[PDB]
Amino acid sequence: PQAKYRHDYRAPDYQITDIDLTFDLDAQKTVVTAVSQAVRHGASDAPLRLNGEDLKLVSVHINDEPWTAWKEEEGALVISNLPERFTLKIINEISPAANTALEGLYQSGDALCTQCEAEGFRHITYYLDRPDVLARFTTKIIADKIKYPFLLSNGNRVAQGELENGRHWVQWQDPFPKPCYLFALVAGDFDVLRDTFTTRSGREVALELYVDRGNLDRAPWAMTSLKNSMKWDEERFGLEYDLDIYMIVAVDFFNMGAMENKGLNIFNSKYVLARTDTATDKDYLDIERVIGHEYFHNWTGNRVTCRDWFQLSLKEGLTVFRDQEFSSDLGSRAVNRINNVRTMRGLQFAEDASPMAHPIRPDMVIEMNNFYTLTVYEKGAEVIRMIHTLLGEENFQKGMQLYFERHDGSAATCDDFVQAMEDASNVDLSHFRRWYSQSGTPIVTVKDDYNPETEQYTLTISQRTPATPDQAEKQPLHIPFAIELYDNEGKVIPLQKGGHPVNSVLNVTQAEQTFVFDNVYFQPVPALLCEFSAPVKLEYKWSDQQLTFLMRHARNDFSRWDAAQSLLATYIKLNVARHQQGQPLSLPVHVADAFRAVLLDEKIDPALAAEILTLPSVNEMAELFDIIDPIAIAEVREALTRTLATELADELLAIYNANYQSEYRVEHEDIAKRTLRNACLRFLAFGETHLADVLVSKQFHEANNMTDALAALSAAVAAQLPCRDALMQEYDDKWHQNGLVMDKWFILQATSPAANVLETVRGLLQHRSFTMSNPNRIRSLIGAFAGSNPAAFHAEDGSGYLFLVEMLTDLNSRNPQVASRLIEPLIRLKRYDAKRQEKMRAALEQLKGLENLSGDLYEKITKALA
Ligand SMILES: CC(C)C[C@H](N)C(=O)O
Ligand code: NA
Ligand code: NA
Ligand code: NA
Numbered sequence: 001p002q003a004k005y006r007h008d009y010r011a012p013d014y015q016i017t018d019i020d021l022t023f024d025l026d027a028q029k030t031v032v033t034a035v036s037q038a039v040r041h042g043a044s045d046a047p048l049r050l051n052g053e054d055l056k057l058v059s060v061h062i063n064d065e066p067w068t069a070w071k072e073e074e075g076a077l078v079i080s081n082l083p084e085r086f087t088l089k090i091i092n093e094i095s096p097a098a099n100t101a102l103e104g105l106y107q108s109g110d111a112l113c114t115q116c117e118a119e120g121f122r123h124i125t126y127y128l129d130r131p132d133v134l135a136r137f138t139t140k141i142i143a144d145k146i147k148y149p150f151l152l153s154n155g156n157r158v159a160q161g162e163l164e165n166g167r168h169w170v171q172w173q174d175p176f177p178k179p180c181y182l183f184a185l186v187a188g189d190f191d192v193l194r195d196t197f198t199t200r201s202g203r204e205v206a207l208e209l210y211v212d213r214g215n216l217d218r219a220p221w222a223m224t225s226l227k228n229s230m231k232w233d234e235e236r237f238g239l240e241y242d243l244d245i246y247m248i249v250a251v252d253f254f255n256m257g258a259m260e261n262k263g264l265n266i267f268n269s270k271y272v273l274a275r276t277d278t279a280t281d282k283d284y285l286d287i288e289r290v291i292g293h294e295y296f297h298n299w300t301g302n303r304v305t306c307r308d309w310f311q312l313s314l315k316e317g318l319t320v321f322r323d324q325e326f327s328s329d330l331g332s333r334a335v336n337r338i339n340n341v342r343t344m345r346g347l348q349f350a351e352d353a354s355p356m357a358h359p360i361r362p363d364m365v366i367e368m369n370n371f372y373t374l375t376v377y378e379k380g381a382e383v384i385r386m387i388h389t390l391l392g393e394e395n396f397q398k399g400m401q402l403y404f405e406r407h408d409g410s411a412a413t414c415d416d417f418v419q420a421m422e423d424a425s426n427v428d429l430s431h432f433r434r435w436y437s438q439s440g441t442p443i444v445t446v447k448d449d450y451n452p453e454t455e456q457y458t459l460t461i462s463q464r465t466p467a468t469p470d471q472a473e474k475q476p477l478h479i480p481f482a483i484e485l486y487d488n489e490g491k492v493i494p495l496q497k498g499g500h501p502v503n504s505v506l507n508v509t510q511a512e513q514t515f516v517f518d519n520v521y522f523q524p525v526p527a528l529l530c531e532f533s534a535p536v537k538l539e540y541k542w543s544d545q546q547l548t549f550l551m552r553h554a555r556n557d558f559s560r561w562d563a564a565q566s567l568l569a570t571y572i573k574l575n576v577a578r579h580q581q582g583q584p585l586s587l588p589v590h591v592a593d594a595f596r597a598v599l600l601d602e603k604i605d606p607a608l609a610a611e612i613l614t615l616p617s618v619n620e621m622a623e624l625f626d627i628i629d630p631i632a633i634a635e636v637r638e639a640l641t642r643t644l645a646t647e648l649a650d651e652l653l654a655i656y657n658a659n660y661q662s663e664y665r666v667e668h669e670d671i672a673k674r675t676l677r678n679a680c681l682r683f684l685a686f687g688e689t690h691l692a693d694v695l696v697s698k699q700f701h702e703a704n705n706m707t708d709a710l711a712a713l714s715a716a717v718a719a720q721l722p723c724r725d726a727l728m729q730e731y732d733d734k735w736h737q738n739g740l741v742m743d744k745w746f747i748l749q750a751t752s753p754a755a756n757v758l759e760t761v762r763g764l765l766q767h768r769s770f771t772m773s774n775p776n777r778i779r780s781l782i783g784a785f786a787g788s789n790p791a792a793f794h795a796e797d798g799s800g801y802l803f804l805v806e807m808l809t810d811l812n813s814r815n816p817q818v819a820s821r822l823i824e825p826l827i828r829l830k831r832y833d834a835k836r837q838e839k840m841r842a843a844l845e846q847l848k849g850l851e852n853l854s855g856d857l858y859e860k861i862t863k864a865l866a
């Protein structure tokens with residue numbers, strides 16, 4: 001399979017302006033009739049090249065003439081000798097029931113639904129399946145009325161009828177031209193929650209959430225979140241919904257999270273269905289963010305779309321930024337920022353050091369479904385947030401306004417967005433653009449000097465990005481480097497130079513530069529890279545007491561968290577080295593005292609406290625190291641938890657009890673208390689066994705909501721408490737019928753520290769709630785094992801690698817997109833020791849030799865083995 005390259009982009013030889021689709025729907029055999037109005041832009045001798053995958057072509061007509069001048073080739077229908085303007089008619093057949101890959105038109109339980117992004121429409125009919133071809137769609141759906149009483153596509157209903165033999169039909173029209181990735185069709189029998197939103201200017205919008213029969217009890221929060229998203233986009237961005245109906249359909253079988261199809265979003269049910277006994281606080285907040293995300297795409301993605309798939313971050317980075325801002329404005333901004341930082345440093349940094357490393361605007365792609373990445377999404381959003389930091393809110397919004405004014409109704413590029421920001425604000429972003437074309441994480445090194453004679457403080461800041469496997473050449477970036485300087489009482493020292501204020505966002509644009517500050521009356525403690533102002537590794541030689549000082553005094557909640565992370569990082573590293581030498585955990589008394597102070601500080605927001613008291617994950621720990629020892633990291637994490645549980649026992653219990661709440665509410669103050677209480681519970685679980693067992697068992701049994709029940713269950717598993725097996729069985733007996741709820745349980749099994757975890761996981765492949773046919777189940781059992789239990793995955797006998805090989809051998813054929821997500825832990829082999837590396841390479845070579853290796857896997861495997 002051949003790579004495609006960004007620099008090869010060329011405007012299409014033909015456009016399609018309007019397409020009329022008819023589907024004669026049936027799960028075994030669906031007949032598609034597609035009538036397109038086309039226009040030639042290129043040379044008169046250029047053929048029309050249509051994409052198509054696994055279609056059975058029935059006929060081809062041009063202006064109602066059966067056509068002879070065409071050929072099928074691999075992935076294509078090539079049509080020659082055309083007029084300049086014509087009507088193309090294609091008839092073809094497809095088979096939804098055979099579609100295990102869940103790309104194109106497929107079955108989800110008894111429903112039929114589509115997934116077209118990135119290149120799935122070509123699995124439905126022969127088309128210009130490229131996002132710079134925007135057309136007006138009309139869609140007629142004909143189906144069995146009993147089996148498919150709801151027939152939905154984008155837009156509004158324009159026609160409806162009933163036929164003989166139990167069939168009926170509905171035709172839809174969407175007035176906005178769209179690329180075909182935004183096409184959707186759904187057919188099935190649903191319960192429908194109906195509501196309304198009235199936009200600021202008075203447009204009335206019918207809101208319709210479609211869920212499987214019997215799930216209406218789990219729909220209101222998603223509907224509430226949709227209305228919250230619509231109000232927020234109006235208040236913050238000045239954007240209103242542009243159509244008359246907003247449909248969301250929740251489907252159980254879905255490879256990703258959710259999809260912004262215009263007026264007809266299709267969601268993984270995981271990001272729709274919640275009630276207090278089935279869903280945790282984190283599930284509620286994920287629903288809210290994903291509902292918001294897809295909604296936000298209506299402007300950033302749909303009204304302005306992507307010229308080509310290399311521009312994916314134009315919509316994904318921007319829309320992630322918007323979802324984060326939405327979450328942050330409605331909820332705790334500090335907690336949102338902390339968690340987005342944890343993702344960046346712990347999961348995205350690892351990708352940017354991997355064989356799959358790419359810039360946020362990639363240059364080369366084999367399979368575009370492989371580039372729906374942490375880099376494109378999360379690092380993309382950090383790049384947008386850097387623009388926001390450089391411009392300020394008002395200028396950023398002027399940029400958004402200029403972007404839409406220029407590009408509304410068109411497919412645009414990352415560069416067009418940057419230019420809009422630059423033009424609206426008059427901030428020069430020429431150098432800044434390199435963030436789009438350069439991969440890897442910059443390392444920023446800071447040294448300081450305080451001169452008491454002149455009362456000047458000097459920061460010497462250097463940057464470099466290490467070469468990555470994709471790019472041998474790197475240059476300095478325009479790094480917005482936010483600082484704050486604290487005096488000995490914890491007060492901010494005004495930044496100034498030569499008698500004028502200096503902006504606290506430093507423009508670090510060179511390999512090395514110095515910044516000098518005047519009137520610095522006390523040696524400062526710096527807060528550096530404030531609110532993670534650029535997506536960089538910071539190297540500054542902090543003393544422990546500078547960090548604990550920041551934990552007590554820093555003005556932004558984020559900086560207090562971050563200082564705690566820097567303090568812990570030193571001792572994590574220490575103790576991994578010690579583990580390798582067979583020595584037990586060592587931690588200074590003063591480090592423990594810093595965490596005790598957080599627990600007893602009444603002035604700290606409990607949301608902030610909870611996050612300081614949540615240890616970095618094993619993924620975040622791994623990025624502290626050049627070579628990862630995943631067993632040492634897992635055992636050090638557990639030992640640190642046990643040490644703090646012992647040293648802080650009485651305080652932990654006291655805070656645990658003080659944050660008890662009898663009423664459950666999905667409200668941010670309540671969520672914050674509960675997060676703190678359950679952070680305390682995690683340590684208490686790892687304390688003296690009898691007390692731990694009683695506390696955990698009681699919380700599980702008395703919980704009035706899934707957040708509390710799961711936090712108890714998860715603690716019983718992590719600490720291997722006596723009550724564990726009984727609680728796990730109780731959960732299974734109560735919830736086995738509910739796949740979303742069982743996913744939590746599969747995660748706990750897959751991430752268990754028990755010595756026989758792999759044997760248990762393999763056994764769970766036959767569990768009543770597990771199926772290889774369902775991406776959520778795969779993720780929750782297999783994916784959690786490979787990706788979230790790196791200790792067991794990287795077991796020295798190589799058993800974790802062999803297990804993943806077997807699963808991937810199945811999934812390569814069944815569902816290559818899911819396969820490719822699951823292979824990611826194996827392609828990190830160069831971060832591990834020689835003996836692991838050998839075993840991981842042997843596993844990759846086995847997969848490389850699969851019959852019918854998917855392009856999705858081929859791309860990753862060949863990068864990994866290079
Ligand atoms: C591949 C698609 C399901 C991704 C979707 N456009 C998103 O917003 O994440
Ligand atoms: Na198939
Ligand atoms: Na067009
Ligand atoms: Na009707």
Ligand code: NA
Nearest residue numbers: 130133179180
């Ligand atoms: Na298109």
Ligand code: NA
Nearest residue numbers: 328329331333
């Ligand atoms: Na907020």
Ligand code: NA
Nearest residue numbers: 366367368855
């Ligand atoms: Na492809």
Ligand code: NA
Nearest residue numbers: 422428429430
């Ligand atoms: Na410029």
Ligand code: NA
Nearest residue numbers: 447448449450
């Ligand atoms: Na110094």
Ligand code: NA
Nearest residue numbers: 447448541542
């Ligand atoms: Na220093």
Ligand code: NA
Nearest residue numbers: 539540541542
């Ligand atoms: Na350091």
Ligand code: NA
Nearest residue numbers: 766767768770
């Ligand atoms: Na099963």
Ligand SMILES: [Zn+2]
Nearest residue numbers: 293297316319
């Ligand atoms: Zn998106």
